[PDB]
């Protein structure tokens, strides 16, 4: 998107699947591309960001408002909350390492939670603001 967005999704994927919680609560089912197979059904997904172009005369940066959705096949979605709670416990104030530039603050934004389809699957989006500096 902006130049940092190649490295940002890579590093927030690496801070995920390293937290001990959400590894005993989701498992290995944290991905962007879905591994085809049986579709385990309590995964998360980390793809859709958008940029709010916060830049400079000398240099330029980006505000990545990336969405991490939590999808859950369970009957209620109290299961999907603690998995999303372990997302938010892992990412606000992250201070991680990027491959192009660095980020300065990984804050938290709106996080809606609803039934996507036939009321069988439950989507909890979690928008995180990622002010990165190129």
């Amino acid at each position: 998107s902006y130049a940092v967005a190649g490295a940002l999704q890579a590093a927030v994927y690496q801070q995920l699947r390293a937290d001990a919680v959400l590894a005993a609560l989701v498992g290995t089912a944290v991905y962007d591309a879905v591994p085809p197979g049986p579709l385990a059904g309590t995964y998360v997904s980390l793809g859709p960001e958008d940029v709010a172009d916060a830049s400079d005369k000398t240099g330029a940066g980006a505000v990545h408002d990336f969405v991490i959705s939590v999808i859950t096949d369970a009957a209620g979605f109290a299961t999907a909350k603690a998995a999303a709670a372990a997302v938010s416990d892992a990412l606000v104030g992250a201070d991680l390492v990027l491959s192009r530039g660095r980020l300065v603050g990984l804050w938290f934004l709106r996080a809606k939670a609803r039934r996507v389809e036939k009321a069988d699957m439950r989507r909890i989006d979690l928008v995180f603001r990622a002010r990165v500096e190129g």
Partner: protein, 110 residues
């Protein structure tokens, strides 16, 4: 009249309620039925973030009274090995009432 040839392990989940009101499913197995599985026109369907591949699969089993173990309720799902067939509805296919149409999906993530 339908020729029943597949063995489908019927599965019913016990609903352990959590503190928030949502039940937690287990999908403990139930006794096995015999059925025919007739496919429908299948195409892949947009899931959440998954490009789920679905086919209609009208499954036909024998019947029972509604308060019996042998009726597939639409709560339940079938499972042949690792191919889970959800149950959309059960509809009493036969005129005399010997056979039940079920309705499945087989949503493989693909």
């Amino acid at each position: 009249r339908p020729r029943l040839n597949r063995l489908l392990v019927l599965e019913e989940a016990v609903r352990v309620a959590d503190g928030a009101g949502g039940h937690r499913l287990d999908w403990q197995a139930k006794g096995e039925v015999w059925a025919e599985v007739t496919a429908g026109s299948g195409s892949e369907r947009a899931g959440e973030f998954v490009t789920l591949a679905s086919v209609p699969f009208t499954i036909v089993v024998r019947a029972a009274p509604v308060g019996a173990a042998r009726r597939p309720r639409p709560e339940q799902r079938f499972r042949e090995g690792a191919r889970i067939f959800r149950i959309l509805a059960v509809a009493e296919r036969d005129r005399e009432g010997h056979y039940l149409s079920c309705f499945a999906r087989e949503e493989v993530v693909a």
